[PDB]
């Protein structure tokens, strides 16, 4: 078995990791191609 303190910690750390994975994905994507100089399209 797990101690209870322990299941909750795990579940807390897993929550944090998912929030951070999401944020990281959203931050990398918000690093957008629109910000590039496309004025060569002329």
């Amino acid at each position: 078995a797990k101690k209870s303190e322990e299941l909750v910690a795990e579940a807390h750390n897993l929550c944090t990791l998912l929030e951070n994975a999401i944020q990281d994905t959203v931050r990398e994507q918000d690093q957008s191609f629109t910000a590039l100089d496309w004025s060569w399209l002329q």
């Binding site: 929030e19 999401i22 959203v26 957008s32 191609f33």
Partner: protein, 62 residues
């Protein structure tokens, strides 16, 4: 007292799931938002790809 330890653990576990559920909902919303921005980014790149293909078409006919 063993029953006391149990009711106290049940309340801790219930609390964790209740917090966890409000956090999952927020996470689902961010992912929905992320899907809306992924979709705007591809639409944008598809215009650029099309404009660039056509400008190369134009120029190659110098």
């Amino acid at each position: 007292e063993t029953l006391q330890r149990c009711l106290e653990e049940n309340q801790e576990l219930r609390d964790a799931i209740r917090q966890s559920n409000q956090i999952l909902r927020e996470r689902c919303e961010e992912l929905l938002h992320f899907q809306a921005s992924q979709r705007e980014e591809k639409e944008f790149l598809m215009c650029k790809f099309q404009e660039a293909r056509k400008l190369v078409e134009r120029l190659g006919l110098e």
